[PDB]
Amino acid sequence: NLCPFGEVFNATRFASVYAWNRKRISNCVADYSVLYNSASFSTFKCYGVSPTKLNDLCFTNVYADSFVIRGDEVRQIAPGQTGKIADYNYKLPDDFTGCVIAWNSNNLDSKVGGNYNYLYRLFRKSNLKPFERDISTEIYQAGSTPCNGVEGFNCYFPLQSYGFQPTNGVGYQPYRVVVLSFELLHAPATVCGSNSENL
Amino acid sequence: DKEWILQKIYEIMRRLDEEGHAEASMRVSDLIYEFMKKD
Ligand SMILES: *[C@@H]1O[C@H](CO)[C@@H](O)[C@H](O)[C@H]1NC(C)=O
């Protein structure tokens, strides 16, 4: 029983960050040295756990979150961050345990003339809770004008599309991000690294 | 007022993307977020 990380990383269609996709990984063995081997990984930051010790560890449950953002916004996929993405799209807790893996996808998520299939939430009345997912598309009332469910003066569709063009600089180029969460509950560990003592 | 200004900045972003200036439209998007989150 091996963990199917190819379904998450080697997936063809990624989700938008506001509707980020979560995959549960359980009852399997994971060789993180396969992912730690640079299959082109621009970011590989782990928190609460050392990246070289992933293969020696076990965890109660593993969550795999995946989405697409700008290169500018990968920094916000981290504990204690603010910004359009960290506040309105995908929020990591302070006590987060896991890794954040990202890589450039300008060769995949950039169409000549602009790829506008990836969306982000620009407007929200409050910041997100950690791991909260907001997929509501109600018109945002930014002012004192009632919106009545239509777009108008200070009444904006909450989602704005990314302008992914291959001519963009790397900061505006699309980046595919995979966030692996390592849950450590009072329960038997179901996901172990390849070098664990079967514990 | 802040209400009229936000409307014009939102319109600028939309027009910039319609003119193909995608990076400038995404940058104004980033500046709309900072503007509205003054609190
Ligand atoms: C994705 O496929 C490539 C092709 O061989 C492979 O090298 C890589 O390890 C795969 N990644 C995952 C997570 O399965």
Strand bridging mode A28-30 / A191-193:
parallel
The DSSP symbol for A53 reads G
Report d(CA A121, CA A65) in Å as an integer: 17
Helix (H) / strand (E) containing B3: helix B2-18
Q: Is the CB of A10 under 6 A from ligand 1?
A: yes
The DSSP symbol for A6 reads T
Q: What angle do CA A197, A51, A71 make, to 5 degrees?
A: 145
Report d(CA A118, CA A133) in Å as an integer: 16
Q: Give residue A195's Cα distance to chain centre.
A: 27
Measure A184 CA to ligand 1 centroid, in angstroms.
27
Atom of ligand 1 nearest to the CA of A4: 14
Torsion of Cα atoms, A100 then A106 then A108 then A109, to 10°: 80
Q: Which CATH number fits domain A21-120+162-193: 3.30.70.920, 3.30.70.1840, 3.40.1180.10, 3.30.70.240?
A: 3.30.70.1840
Sign, CA dihedral A150-A116-A22-A121, equals negative
Residue in the block written with tokens 């506001």:
A18
Residue in the block written with tokens 């390592």:
A182
Q: Is the CB of A36 under 6 A from ligand 1?
A: no
User: Which residues is A28 bridged to in the sheet?
Assistant: A191
Measure A159 CA to ligand 1 centroid, in angstroms.
33
Contact (CB, 8 A) for A99 and A180 = yes
Q: Is the CB of A11 under 6 A from ligand 1?
A: no
Listed by start position, the domains of chain A span 21-120+162-193
Contact (CB, 8 A) for A154 and A141 = yes
The residue count for chain B: 39
In angstroms, this model's resolution equals 2.3
Any CB–CB contact under 8 A between A175 and chain B?
no
The range of the structural domain enclosing residue B9 comes to: 2-36
Determine the residue of chain B that is closest to A84 in CA distance.
B33
Report d(CA A68, CA A175) in Å as an integer: 5
User: Considering its fold, how many domains does chain B have in total?
Assistant: 1
